[PDB]
Amino acid sequence: QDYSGFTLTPSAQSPRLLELTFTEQTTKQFLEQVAEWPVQALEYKSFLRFRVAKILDDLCANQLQPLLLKTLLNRAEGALLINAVGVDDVKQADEMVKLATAVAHLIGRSNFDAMSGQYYARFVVKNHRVMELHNDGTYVEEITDYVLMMKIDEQNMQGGNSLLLHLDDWEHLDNYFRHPLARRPMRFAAKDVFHPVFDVDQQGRPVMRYIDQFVQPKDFEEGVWLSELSDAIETSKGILSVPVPVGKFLLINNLFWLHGRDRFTPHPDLRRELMRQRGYFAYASNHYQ
Amino acid sequence: QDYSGFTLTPSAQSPRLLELTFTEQTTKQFLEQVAEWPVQALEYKSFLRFRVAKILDDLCANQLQPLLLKTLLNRAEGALLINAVGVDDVKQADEMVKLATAVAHLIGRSNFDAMSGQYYARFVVKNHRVMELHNDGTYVEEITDYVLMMKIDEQNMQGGNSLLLHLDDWEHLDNYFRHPLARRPMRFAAKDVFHPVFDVDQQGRPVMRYIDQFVQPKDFEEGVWLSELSDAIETSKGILSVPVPVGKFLLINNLFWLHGRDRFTPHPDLRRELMRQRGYFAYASNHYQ
Amino acid sequence: QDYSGFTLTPSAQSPRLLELTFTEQTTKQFLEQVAEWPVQALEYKSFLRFRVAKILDDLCANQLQPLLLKTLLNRAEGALLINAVGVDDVKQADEMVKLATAVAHLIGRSNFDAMSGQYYARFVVKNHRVMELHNDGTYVEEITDYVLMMKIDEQNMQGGNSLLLHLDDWEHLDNYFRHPLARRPMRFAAKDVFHPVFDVDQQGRPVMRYIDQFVQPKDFEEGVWLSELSDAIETSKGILSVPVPVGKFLLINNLFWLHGRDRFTPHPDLRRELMRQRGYFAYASNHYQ
Amino acid sequence: QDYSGFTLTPSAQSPRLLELTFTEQTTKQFLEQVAEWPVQALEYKSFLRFRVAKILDDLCANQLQPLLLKTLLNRAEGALLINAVGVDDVKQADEMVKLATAVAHLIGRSNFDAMSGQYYARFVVKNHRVMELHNDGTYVEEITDYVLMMKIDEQNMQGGNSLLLHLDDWEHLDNYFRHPLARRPMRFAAKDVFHPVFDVDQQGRPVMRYIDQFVQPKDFEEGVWLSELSDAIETSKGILSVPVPVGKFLLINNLFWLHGRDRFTPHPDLRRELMRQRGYFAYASNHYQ
Ligand SMILES: [Fe+2]
Ligand SMILES: [Fe+2]
Ligand SMILES: [Fe+2]
Ligand SMILES: [Fe+2]
């Protein structure tokens, strides 16, 4: 269909990854209407995160929030690459944070990031290897429903695409899901938590909560299996390789998408800045009370 | 009426805010009788806080403690601006702390202040924006019954009045109090605590436990409402603007008064020193055992 | 009677305070027999504290341990001033610690001292006011049964005697013990603990757990009473003033003795070093199992 | 018998201590096959510890894991001295860690080492006294089943042999095991834990959880007994004195072996580097579900 304030087109890498682009009129109006709250105001007063969310959704005739929720919750999709025309330079990092915040807080709430002390975190990489596919939030009890990763800056960067794996594109899903250890609660440590690497959604379809660094196999049986699982994920033919240009961000359902990052070329002048948010879904629906 | 040791007159800003002034004979006698305990003695031995309280009340023929309790607990009032003639210069900061301590510990006990490590805290501001109305103690389980804010120093200060809002002067009270989210326990974080923004006193009248920085709306529904609540409070026509000259302190019922601070003019030589205490009420009354 | 290895004579200040002096043959033999364990060995391996205790008691034909327990547990007494001939100079501080350790671990076990990180602590004072009478261990749940305070060094020291008050020499005991607030559990804070300032021993006789710095009266009623209690203790005619020369230590029952320290004369060359241990009683007795 | 990939011969010190030596073909093949995972990879992803374990066991035709478990669990034995030909120089410390990791994770899992922050720890000693026999893990609730101690470097080292005591070579075992205090839970502190110094295996045979530094006797009775126990262990005629050359490691059952270290000669150029791992057993067996 045709949407108010933005366009939605499938990506070249996969029909499951949809590209959402806010128009120029939508973008400059949003930035104008949220100009009176700097990013530090969003940091200090969390309800402003929801206020700028509403402002953005209002500028899209309230078509954005239902579209975001539909896409992220659709098992067939669950992934967005989002950008706003005119917001594509590192000098607009604050506008980038505002826009991502507004998008994230239409579908839920972003959790505290221990590495930044805020509801979002920015990293710069300077001075090489593939970051293996994984889910976020595997070492805490609360489920992380979504991962938001935004490219703030990118200079002298060859490679480094975001890697994505939708569980239903993973050719080995059934082999590992049907193994008894898939249901075995395992220890995860950054207090420790225990949960299986696999679970099911409400329909019985597999979801995952996996990362190689924080899973703690208790014995030879668990360790060998996890090392085979790791291999079966990293060599999967279903992995997507997605460039994320400055100003764009991926927003993915953390339960049936795994994400990672490809190796990049070391270069003295290399600078890549990322912004991340992770949170849970929260939305109105017709259900029992 | 006429009181022993002090005078009580309504303020120019509101009949709910009463000005209590200790006479010169009362003030110099109190300071004499408490001279043997410096402020550091009140810090180290908390029962001395109550001893100087009794000394002050005794010098007022025991009319002070019942008057303080009557005023602070009276829904129609609940707020005092207190001073002592001759105590009006920053060089008398210790006398100021002693006097405020004696007053506070006639009606209750001042709680530990994490920012100072003592039962009171002093701030100096040097080197601009309005501090929004709020209640203290919203992020701990124990109720903060009273807020004490004392002007220790003020130099080259244009503006910066204390802002006050009595809930019964808030023209939007019923609109927000009657909303279902008014009774929804929300998360507050500086361990997290959960409580609604609104509650009731013993008679069913609204009281509040609100601050925009520490309330953590869990979703879009809560966030938008809190952002409207914030606006409805900050633009209320009922807000009082009270100058607090050096040596005076506000003492207010933290349950149905919100407090804040107006914007002030930045000035190189600007110095404003404040002293704060927060605590709970504790007092004798005829009730069942 | 006549004891093996030591003498026992009443002090000049009170028949309740007994002076125990280890003879020269007892002292040099003990130091010889414990020479192979330096103080740091007693710090690292707590069972050595009991080994040197046994060694000392064995050198007294096993008359020391029963005498120590009898004296410390006797309501009429409960206090010892202990020394060993030839151990009276700060250069013998390690011998002092060994001797005090052996004595303490015949009657119980010394608790971890947070200020030193060991089962004992040494302080030096250099660069004035009376330290009010009190019990130790009032802000933890476990009862501190005994206090051991040893004079390691004393130079250019006028005054500074240890102050002692046996509850049965306190002329106001009955007045405060019979007050309802004597049985009121009050908050003590250095996690907080709650216990009354007064309690009873197994026979119903008053014992105390009081210090002015850490008791936290919750309201005007408790604060005024504690401030009167404090005054009634500090002005008691029953207070003993005991010089503690280098090499001597007081060992007192912390339940019915309060201890403190008199004011001393400031002097540029003043140096006083103390060693303290606090612990619980533990001893064999004929009782039911 | 004859094993695939390694040889097994009894030590000169005791038939209970078996020497396991990986052949050159086994060693160079293992190092080749695990070359793609550096030690830091084993630190960050614990399942790789089990992957290199399997790789090593596969190179021994799967005869290694059952042999390791049989030996460590055999009451008559329970101790291995393990090495790999060609791995005997401090410059091969990473190969040493890889090999020890593979061995340890065939029989169980190595626990987090608080002193290193990793599943193993390396110490260097430079700049004298005997380290008394003891068990590891006495101050936590979880049982430490095995201790792994590897000699990484040794220069200008006279003495310093590892000391070992198998409980069934301890001529005083029955005397202390039959004492009532052997079954008395005692306090151990580095939260505190309580457990007896002695326990039994599944057959009722004594096992121990003892160290002199962390056991905290509560009274004279416990302290004197522990000090006699300590003496009876340290003077036992059953103690083995085992040189551990660079590249070799002891792997012992921590329940019925105590370990320690002999005094060594201080020397300006002395350098000895050790690597330790401690963990629990975990292995497949036929038992009820
Ligand atoms: Fe991630
Ligand atoms: Fe405030
Ligand atoms: Fe004391
Ligand atoms: Fe050890």
Curated annotation (Swiss-Prot), chains A, B, C, D:
Q: Does the keyword Iron apply?
A: yes
Say which enzyme class the record assigns: oxidoreductase
- Provide the cofactor list for this protein: Fe(2+)
User: Induction of this protein: by what?
Assistant: Expression is induced by RpoS during carbon starvation and at stationary phase. Is also regulated by cAMP-CRP and Lrp, which play the roles of a nearly essential activator and of a positive modulator, respectively. Repressed by CsiR. Makes part of the operon glaH-lhgD-gabDTP.
Q: Which GO terms describe its molecular function?
A: ferrous iron binding; glutarate dioxygenase activity; identical protein binding; iron ion binding; oxidoreductase activity, acting on paired donors, with incorporation or reduction of molecular oxygen, with 2-oxoglutarate as one donor, and the other dehydrogenated
One GO-annotated biological process of the protein: L-lysine catabolic process
Q: Which reaction does it catalyse?
A: glutarate + 2-oxoglutarate + O2 = (S)-2-hydroxyglutarate + succinate + CO2
Give the EC number(s) under which this enzyme is classified.
1.14.11.64
Keywords, comma-separated and alphabetical: Dioxygenase, Iron, Metal-binding, Oxidoreductase
Q: What happens biologically when this protein's gene is inactivated, per the record?
A: Cells lacking this gene accumulate higher levels of glutarate than wild-type during carbon starvation and entry into the stationary phase.
The free-text note explaining how the cofactor binds reads:
Binds 1 Fe(2+) ion per subunit.
- Pathway the protein acts in: Amino-acid degradation
Kindly state one GO CC term assigned in the UniProt record. protein-containing complex
What family does this belong to? Belongs to the glutarate hydroxylase family.
Q: How does the record describe its quaternary structure?
A: Homotetramer.
**Chain's role:** Acts as an alpha-ketoglutarate-dependent dioxygenase catalyzing hydroxylation of glutarate (GA) to L-2-hydroxyglutarate (L2HG) in the stationary phase of E.coli. Functions in a L-lysine degradation pathway that proceeds via cadaverine, glutarate and L-2-hydroxyglutarate. Other dicarboxylic acids (oxalate, malonate, succinate, adipate, and pimelate) are not substrates for this enzyme.
Name of the featured protein = Glutarate 2-hydroxylase
